[PDB]
Amino acid sequence: TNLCPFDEVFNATTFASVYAWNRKRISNCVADYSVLYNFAPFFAFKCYGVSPTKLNDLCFTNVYADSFVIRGNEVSQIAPGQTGNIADYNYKLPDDFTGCVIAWNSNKLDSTVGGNYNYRYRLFRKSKLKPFERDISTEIYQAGNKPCNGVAGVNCYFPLQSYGFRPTYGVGHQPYRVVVLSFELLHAPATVCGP
Amino acid sequence: STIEEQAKTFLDKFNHEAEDLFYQSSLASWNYNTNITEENVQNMNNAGDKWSAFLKEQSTLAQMYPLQEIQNLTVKLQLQALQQNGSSVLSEDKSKRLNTILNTMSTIYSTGKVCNPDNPQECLLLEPGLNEIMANSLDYNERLWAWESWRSEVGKQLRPLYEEYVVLKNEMARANHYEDYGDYWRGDYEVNGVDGYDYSRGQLIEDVEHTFEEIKPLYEHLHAYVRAKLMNAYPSYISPIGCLPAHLLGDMWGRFWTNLYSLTVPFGQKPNIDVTDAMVDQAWDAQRIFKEAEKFFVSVGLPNMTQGFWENSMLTDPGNVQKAVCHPTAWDLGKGDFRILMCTKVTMDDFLTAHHEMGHIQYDMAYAAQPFLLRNGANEGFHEAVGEIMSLSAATPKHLKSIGLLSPDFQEDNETEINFLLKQALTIVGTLPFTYMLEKWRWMVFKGEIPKDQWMKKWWEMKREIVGVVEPVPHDETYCDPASLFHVSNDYSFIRYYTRTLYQFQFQEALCQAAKHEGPLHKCDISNSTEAGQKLFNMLRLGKSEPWTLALENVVGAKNMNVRPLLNYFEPLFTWLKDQNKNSFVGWSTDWSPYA
Numbered sequence: 001t002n003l004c005p006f007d008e009v010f011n012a013t014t015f016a017s018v019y020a021w022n023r024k025r026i027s028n029c030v031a032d033y034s035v036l037y038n039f040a041p042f043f044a045f046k047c048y049g050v051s052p053t054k055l056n057d058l059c060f061t062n063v064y065a066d067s068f069v070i071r072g073n074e075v076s077q078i079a080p081g082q083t084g085n086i087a088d089y090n091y092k093l094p095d096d097f098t099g100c101v102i103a104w105n106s107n108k109l110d111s112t113v114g115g116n117y118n119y120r121y122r123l124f125r126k127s128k129l130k131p132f133e134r135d136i137s138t139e140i141y142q143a144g145n146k147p148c149n150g151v152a153g154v155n156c157y158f159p160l161q162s163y164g165f166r167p168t169y170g171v172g173h174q175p176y177r178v179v180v181l182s183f184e185l186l187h188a189p190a191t192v193c194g195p
Numbered sequence: 196s197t198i199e200e201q202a203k204t205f206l207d208k209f210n211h212e213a214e215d216l217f218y219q220s221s222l223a224s225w226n227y228n229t230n231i232t233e234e235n236v237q238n239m240n241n242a243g244d245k246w247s248a249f250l251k252e253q254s255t256l257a258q259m260y261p262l263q264e265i266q267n268l269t270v271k272l273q274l275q276a277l278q279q280n281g282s283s284v285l286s287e288d289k290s291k292r293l294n295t296i297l298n299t300m301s302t303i304y305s306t307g308k309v310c311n312p313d314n315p316q317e318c319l320l321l322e323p324g325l326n327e328i329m330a331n332s333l334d335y336n337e338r339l340w341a342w343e344s345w346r347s348e349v350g351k352q353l354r355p356l357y358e359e360y361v362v363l364k365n366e367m368a369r370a371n372h373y374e375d376y377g378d379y380w381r382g383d384y385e386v387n388g389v390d391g392y393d394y395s396r397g398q399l400i401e402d403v404e405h406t407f408e409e410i411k412p413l414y415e416h417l418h419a420y421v422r423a424k425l426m427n428a429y430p431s432y433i434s435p436i437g438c439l440p441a442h443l444l445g446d447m448w449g450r451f452w453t454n455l456y457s458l459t460v461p462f463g464q465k466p467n468i469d470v471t472d473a474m475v476d477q478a479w480d481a482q483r484i485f486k487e488a489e490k491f492f493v494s495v496g497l498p499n500m501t502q503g504f505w506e507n508s509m510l511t512d513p514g515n516v517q518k519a520v521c522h523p524t525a526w527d528l529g530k531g532d533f534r535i536l537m538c539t540k541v542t543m544d545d546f547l548t549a550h551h552e553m554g555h556i557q558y559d560m561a562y563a564a565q566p567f568l569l570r571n572g573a574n575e576g577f578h579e580a581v582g583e584i585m586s587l588s589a590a591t592p593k594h595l596k597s598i599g600l601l602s603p604d605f606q607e608d609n610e611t612e613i614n615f616l617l618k619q620a621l622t623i624v625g626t627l628p629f630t631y632m633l634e635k636w637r638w639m640v641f642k643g644e645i646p647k648d649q650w651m652k653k654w655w656e657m658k659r660e661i662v663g664v665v666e667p668v669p670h671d672e673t674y675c676d677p678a679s680l681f682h683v684s685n686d687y688s689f690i691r692y693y694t695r696t697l698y699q700f701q702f703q704e705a706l707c708q709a710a711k712h713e714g715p716l717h718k719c720d721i722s723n724s725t726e727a728g729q730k731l732f733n734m735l736r737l738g739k740s741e742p743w744t745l746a747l748e749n750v751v752g753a754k755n756m757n758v759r760p761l762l763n764y765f766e767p768l769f770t771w772l773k774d775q776n777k778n779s780f781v782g783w784s785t786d787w788s789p790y791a
């Protein structure tokens with residue numbers, strides 16, 4: 001009956017850091033996936049399991065609009081069965097993933113000549129991330145054999161690094177605004193529909 | 196958790212903070228060089244000072260991961276380059292004397308002036324003063340005056356400094372487990388731990404001299420021919436069997452003979468190839484020059500200039516008020532940002548240089564995938580050889596005909612081929628004995644073989660014996676003639692210019708063969724041969740991750756520096772030189788001198 005707040009997630013004013021990837025739960029609303037184009041210079045629309053063509057057909061129990069920012073080189077990592085710092089430790093997608101991945105260059109919005117260190121990723125983590133897990137802990141990462149005692153130092157590195165986006169960077173080091181659309185499908189009424 | 200693993204994570208954190216800080220220093224050096232003001236100068240010092248104090252800090256945290264317990268050679272190289280102490284290993288007093296000396300010598304040279312004897316008000320800097328005399332004048336005493344004054348005013352001050360400079364630089368080297376400062380300088384070429392590709396620092400001296408033996412016949416003929424033509428231009432002054440006076444070689448020192456082409460051109464009636472006039476006719480700007488240059492690399496299968504490159508680069512002098520340093524350089528700021536700073540006029544010189552500097556950019560883009568500390572040429576001589584083989588192919592008649600700058604009706608006759616090869620040999624061949632000898636004299640000064648009371652004596656002894664060049668005025672040990680050259684009083688290794696020369700012809704002969712070029716090697720144009728760009732690329736992407744011996748083999752199929760390609764490129768001139776010297780004297784005498 002009401003339009004899903006695709007305006008909210010895709011427009012926004014700030015998005016997230018990928019380690020704290022921000023999920024909007026979409027339910028009981030009409031989906032109009034055809035509006036999803038903001039005319040961005042390096043737009044991507046890969047979709048797995050489901051078919052991106054005619055995406056306004058299939059109902060689902062929920063539609064999880066996960067949103068965050070990563071640099072262009074790492075955009076390819078937002079896909080089933082990938083590797084690298086983003087998929088390893090920050091935001092993993094499952095093997096049989098059945099949603100959509102929608103990124104777009106945002107150098108306009110998130111860079112700064114002095115450098116924008118607000119967006120973070122997770123450089124080190126003791127284990128690989130299970131699909132759709134989120135790590136937001138600031139546990140001082142122990143790399144050596146002496147305990148770290150919650151303070152950084154030798155072999156005790158803070159696990160979060162800043163991107164430092166500047167407008168003079170390159171295409172692969174520039175901030176891209178990813179939006180995943182995770183299509184859950186349970187035994188439920190599957191309220192998320194709409195032509 | 197082992198120590199190789201802790202080193203992995205230590206470098207992983209370093210690789211991300213180093214990339215972020217090195218960028219700010221690079222973009223602070225960029226904004227100064229493009230916009231010289233007294234605000235930019237301050238910040239270039241700032242971001243550099245944080246960077247020089249971040250590397251210095253990180254060096255100490257790295258010493259804790261011993262190399263012998265790291266088995267991944269990729270990790271070993273990063274740790275080894277990060278554990279470099281350098282001047283740090285000297286005391287806070289001696290580490291201060293050295294930087295006072297280096298700053299004093301650099302300023303004495305770059306600000307050195309000599310004032311007219313007839314006119315003690317008029318003075319001249321090295322540029323655009325005395326260097327303007329050395330290049331364009333053909334008077335004898337006008338040249339001798341500048342040559343002798345520059346080495347007796349600037350040189351005599353630098354002598355006591357260079358004596359202390361040698362002492363401290365050795366102490367720094369011996370503290371970092373190096374024989375002398377020269378041994379420290381030859382560590383650039385060293386390889387360890389990779390069987391079949393190892394290389395010791397002593398092997399460089401063996402290689403450099405062994406190859407130079409094969410150069411000697413070609414040089415003794417270029418020397419004898421040039422001497423004959425010079426003897427006809429300075430009749431009373433030049434002997435037919437003795438060395439060339441050092442002030443008649445085209446520059447202040449004799450480094451390059453390029454300026455003697457006016458006096459030595461074999462077939463002066465036939466013209467030089469100069470597409471400057473043709474570029475003007477067709478309405479060419481610097482935009483076109485780099486676009487055509489970008490097209491050349493795309494033809495061999497290399498990528499296009501990044502979308503940021505065109506937006507941010509300085510391809511023309513902004514002129515007017517905003518001043519700059521116009522010296523052409525290729526900037527790898529990192530984080531995907533690549534730029535060229537070039538004040539480009541529409542000539543042929545700047546057409547070839549744009550190909551040369553963009554060759555550096557292509558190398559930088561190729562190895563950008565590597566870790567931070569491994570983003571550099573395999574050794575020092577690699578990076579410049581990559582740029583020079585781009586101007587090699589782009590300057591040929593074949594490439595100029597295929598872009599519309601030379602009419603398909605101009606015909607390549609053997610006399611112009613000799614005209615071409617000589618003007619190449621003056622620059623390229625003539626510098627090899629100057630370069631090898633100069634770094635030989637520095638190597639021996641550091642190693643202790645030449646006493647202080649013999650410095651200038653063994654210099655001019657080797658100038659006569661190796662370079663085949665003689666001083667016009669006898670010099671005691673209060674001169675420092677090597678110090679009057681930039682690279683010597685500013686602490687730069689010079690052997691790279693010898694190795695770079697031999698490397699570039701090895702590449703060109705290996706690329707042109709993969710391009711199925713048939714004919715003399717000096718006619719080749721690697722354009723449109725993707726097989727050639729592939730072969731070059733597989734070395735470019737390595738950077739420092741592989742030993743320079745392996746990288747050289749992935750292009751030419753040989754593990755070590757060779758000279759046969761350089762001779763092969765110059766062979767048509769070689770036999771023509773053996774002809775024109777039929778009744779001249781080939782060789783020189785080491786006790787002739789114009790000063791009696």
Ligand SMILES: *[C@@H]1O[C@H](CO)[C@@H](O[C@@H]2O[C@H](CO)[C@@H](O)[C@H](O)[C@H]2NC(C)=O)[C@H](O)[C@H]1NC(C)=O
Binds near residue numbers: 278280284371372
């Ligand atoms: C750079 O200098 C450091 C500091 O002296 C060297 O590391 C020390 O070397 C001494 C040699 O006697 C050892 O006793 C120390 O245990 C070392 N470690 C520390 C933390 O002091 C380092 O070896 C030098 N680097 C090179 C390449 O020589």
Ligand SMILES: *[C@@H]1O[C@H](CO)[C@@H](O)[C@H](O)[C@H]1NC(C)=O
Binds near residue numbers: 007011012
């Ligand atoms: C995004 O929000 C801003 C501020 O509310 C608004 O001006 C803009 O039109 C929005 N973009 C849309 C709705 O596409």
Ligand SMILES: *[C@@H]1O[C@H](CO)[C@@H](O)[C@H](O)[C@H]1NC(C)=O
Binds near residue numbers: 267270
């Ligand atoms: C060294 O490490 C790199 C990356 O850490 C890895 O790709 C490579 O295989 C390692 N080398 C060896 C010999 O294991």
Ligand SMILES: *[C@@H]1O[C@H](CO)[C@@H](O)[C@H](O)[C@H]1NC(C)=O
Binds near residue numbers: 493
């Ligand atoms: C290089 O330019 C050509 C011509 O416009 C273009 O087709 C090609 O896609 C460009 N290279 C890349 C990697 O995009």
Ligand SMILES: *[C@@H]1O[C@H](CO)[C@@H](O)[C@H](O)[C@H]1NC(C)=O
Binds near residue numbers: 230232516517518
């Ligand atoms: C570059 O220098 C000029 C002075 O000629 C100045 O007006 C300009 O503001 C400088 N650039 C920037 C980005 O400030």
Ligand SMILES: [Zn+2]
Binds near residue numbers: 552555579
């Ligand atoms: Zn260069």
